[PDB]
Amino acid sequence: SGFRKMAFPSGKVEGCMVQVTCGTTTLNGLWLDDTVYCPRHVICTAEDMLNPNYEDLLIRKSNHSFLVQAGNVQLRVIGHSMQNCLLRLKVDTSNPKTPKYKFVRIQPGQTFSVLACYNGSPSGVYQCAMRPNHTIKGSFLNGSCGSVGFNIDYDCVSFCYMHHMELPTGVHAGTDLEGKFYGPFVDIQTAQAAGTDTTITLNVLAWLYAAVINGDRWFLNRFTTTLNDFNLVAMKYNYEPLTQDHVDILGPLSAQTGIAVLDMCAALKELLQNGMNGRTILGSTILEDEFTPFDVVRQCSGVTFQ
Amino acid sequence: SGFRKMAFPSGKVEGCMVQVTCGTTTLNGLWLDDTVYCPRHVICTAEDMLNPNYEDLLIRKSNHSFLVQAGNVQLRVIGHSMQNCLLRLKVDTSNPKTPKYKFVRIQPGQTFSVLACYNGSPSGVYQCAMRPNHTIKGSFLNGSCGSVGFNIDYDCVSFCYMHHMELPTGVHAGTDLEGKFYGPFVDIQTAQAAGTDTTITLNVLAWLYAAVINGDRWFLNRFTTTLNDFNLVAMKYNYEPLTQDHVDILGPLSAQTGIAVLDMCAALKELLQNGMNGRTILGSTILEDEFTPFDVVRQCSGVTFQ
Ligand SMILES: *C(=O)[C@H](Cc1cnc[nH]1)NC[C@@H]1C[C@H]2CCCC[C@@H]2CN1C(=O)c1ccc(-c2ccccc2)cc1
Ligand SMILES: *C(=O)[C@H](Cc1cnc[nH]1)NC[C@@H]1C[C@H]2CCCC[C@@H]2CN1C(=O)c1ccc(-c2ccccc2)cc1
Numbered sequence: 031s032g033f034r035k036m037a038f039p040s041g042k043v044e045g046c047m048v049q050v051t052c053g054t055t056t057l058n059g060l061w062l063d064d065t066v067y068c069p070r071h072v073i074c075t076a077e078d079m080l081n082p083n084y085e086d087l088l089i090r091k092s093n094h095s096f097l098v099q100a101g102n103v104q105l106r107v108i109g110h111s112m113q114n115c116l117l118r119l120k121v122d123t124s125n126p127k128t129p130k131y132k133f134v135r136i137q138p139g140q141t142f143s144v145l146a147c148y149n150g151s152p153s154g155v156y157q158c159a160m161r162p163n164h165t166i167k168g169s170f171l172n173g174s175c176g177s178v179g180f181n182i183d184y185d186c187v188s189f190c191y192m193h194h195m196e197l198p199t200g201v202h203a204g205t206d207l208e209g210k211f212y213g214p215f216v217d218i219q220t221a222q223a224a225g226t227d228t229t230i231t232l233n234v235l236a237w238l239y240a241a242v243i244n245g246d247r248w249f250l251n252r253f254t255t256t257l258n259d260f261n262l263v264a265m266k267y268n269y270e271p272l273t274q275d276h277v278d279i280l281g282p283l284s285a286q287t288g289i290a291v292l293d294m295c296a297a298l299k300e301l302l303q304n305g306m307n308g309r310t311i312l313g314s315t316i317l318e319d320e321f322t323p324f325d326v327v328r329q330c331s332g333v334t335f336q
Numbered sequence: 337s338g339f340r341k342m343a344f345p346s347g348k349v350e351g352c353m354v355q356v357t358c359g360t361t362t363l364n365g366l367w368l369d370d371t372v373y374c375p376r377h378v379i380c381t382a383e384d385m386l387n388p389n390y391e392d393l394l395i396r397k398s399n400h401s402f403l404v405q406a407g408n409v410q411l412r413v414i415g416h417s418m419q420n421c422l423l424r425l426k427v428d429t430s431n432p433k434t435p436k437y438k439f440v441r442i443q444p445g446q447t448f449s450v451l452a453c454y455n456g457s458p459s460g461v462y463q464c465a466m467r468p469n470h471t472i473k474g475s476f477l478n479g480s481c482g483s484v485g486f487n488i489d490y491d492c493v494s495f496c497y498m499h500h501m502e503l504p505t506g507v508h509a510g511t512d513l514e515g516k517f518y519g520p521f522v523d524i525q526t527a528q529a530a531g532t533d534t535t536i537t538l539n540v541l542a543w544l545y546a547a548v549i550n551g552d553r554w555f556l557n558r559f560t561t562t563l564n565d566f567n568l569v570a571m572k573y574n575y576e577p578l579t580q581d582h583v584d585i586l587g588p589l590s591a592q593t594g595i596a597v598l599d600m601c602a603a604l605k606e607l608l609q610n611g612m613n614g615r616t617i618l619g620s621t622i623l624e625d626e627f628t629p630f631d632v633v634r635q636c637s638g639v640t641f642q
Contacts, residue, residue, distance in 0.1 A: 031506035032475035036460035041347025154342035169338035200337035316621055
């Protein structure tokens with residue numbers, strides 16, 4: 031029993047974290063095999079960035095313009111190339127701790143674990159959702175660039191996020207590991223703001239289901255709703271509209287609990303309309319939206335408490 | 337910027353997690369050097385436990401009564417002894433991934449990271465406080481026994497918790513790694529309840545300070561308080577009394593922000609008395625009490641935002 035935001039165990043990622051220096055800028059990179067990945071802005075000086083041309087900035091560098099260090103070993107760069115907003119540095123040593131892995135572009139609402147790193151040294155791990163506005167509410171200080179976000183299935187690490195910058199609201203932006211930003215952001219130090227965000231309706235519902243699997247039914251009701259009537263209520267409260275595809279994804283949770291999705295939808299609508307009345311769900315006073323249906327199934331018991 | 341409950345990177349602990357089987361009971365153990373630690377209740381059958389005598393149960397076992405497996409290697413037990421509520425199994429192989437480490441008995445209010453494990457295989461990591469009632473609000477299912485709680489300083493892992501059982505309220509109990517329970521609990525399947533808990537006042541204050549370091553001052557006020565007047569208010573709201581020692585511990589946070597402890601105390605008292613008025617602190621609607629002063633300093637910037 032219990033329900034906690036839970037990260038994946040970070041050791042397989044820890045063994046891939048290096049330090050990458052270009053000039054007087056130091057930041058993280060991810061060492062897989064004989065490649066190191068890192069933000070391409072490592073090659074900028076506080077001046078260049080206001081308006082950088084990365085093609086023109088990079089052609090000015092050589093292999094020995096970059097220093098890569100793993101623990102206290104120095105790795106020698108023998109190649110380099112740009113891929114969207116990342117650099118790929120080829121190194122003379124293949125990482126012997128490289129895990130089975132792949133790169134994935136994660137979708138909005140999905141969650142992942144972040145290994146916060148400084149100077150190539152892992153410092154902490156927490157769990158994050160990709161917000162609908164393509165930002166993450168992370169915890170990051172200067173030097174955290176190139177820290178990665180990942181999920182682990184079996185022995186395989188699916189990397190999905192590399193940190194590049196903080197936005198003026200204090201939220202974070204970055205790329206997949208093909209160097210494509212999440213959201214309409216760019217790696218320039220300019221005026222750049224997060225667009226308006228929405229609550230992740232599907233996650234709210236998944237978490238309602240966790241609460242029933244864990245033994246709590248107080249917020250249920252005798253009513254049902256159409257998908258469409260649910261959505262008029264959703265827009266009023268700034269929730270993402272619910273789609274038939276989201277309804278489908280809730281099938282397994284619906285089945286474990288015997289509560290119809292749309293019956294849970296009506297529960298949610300009553301909650302949005304009336305409040306929680308001083309009560310909690312799973313220890314929370316607020317409706318929680320950063321646990322996916324997958325996260326609820328992974329964490330919760332397969333047997334419902336009653 | 338940001339503020340997240342953040343766990344320590346779990347890799348150094350992952351490399352110590354094994355599976356320990358006695359009879360038909362399987363649960364975790366912690367492999368350091370040539371010893372495996374685990375809950376001594378692994379030797380019980382659902383029957384024995386209702387009223388076990390562990391001395392009498394253990395003398396009935398041999399070394400080959402226990403099976404220890406690390407990944408897919410079988411480790412051979414060559415010795416065993418009881419230490420309070422743990423077994424120490426001596427094994428024929430010393431863990432080559434043993435980190436620098438020690439064992440610590442953590443104090444109430446203090447926090448640590450838990451590596452949730454099943455069948456010797458790490459599944460997740462989250463952060464926990466030791467509640468004042470000596471329970472943890474964990475997330476654990478059957479088979480999680482022998483999962484450990486730890487902190488990491490430099491390269492050294494301070495283990496402080498091994499999981500033994502779940503209580504009827506859904507909270508968790510366990511031991512330090514000398515096998516002494518935290519709290520008045522025992523490893524018997526009997527009626528056993530968590531005593532009344534209190535909010536960890538010191539943590540509340542530390543988190544108020546995080547919010548100011550991060551740039552938010554809205555809940556401050558022009559008032560001050562005596563320690564003693566603060567405490568009459570504290571008892572009314574079920575907060576732990578604040579002591580001069582707690583006041584001292586807040587010194588560094590007080591100094592970084594220029595807000596006197598007792599001025600923060602008066603801020604807190606007004607918050608308890610009036611509520612948060614629909615507002616949030618650090619994204620929370622509620623007063624948060626599972627970040628220590630140390631946790632705030634570790635995570636927050638050393639330069640206050642204004
Ligand atoms: C990376 O470590 C940080 C991440 C962060 C900070 N706080 C929270 N998260 N971001 C780097 C930050 C923003 C990016 C955006 C894209 C262009 C580069 C710019 C770099 N940057 C800086 O603040 C920065 C300022 C100045 C310098 C610098 C370089 C040479 C000489 C003097 C200064 C480098 C980076
Ligand atoms: C350990 O894995 C779980 C931890 C847990 C479960 N949910 C959340 N956290 N606790 C084991 C649980 C409680 C302890 C208390 C101390 C005495 C032993 C008892 C073991 N236990 C059981 O539920 C349990 C029941 C039955 C058996 C069993 C043994 C042999 C044959 C049939 C059954 C073993 C453990």
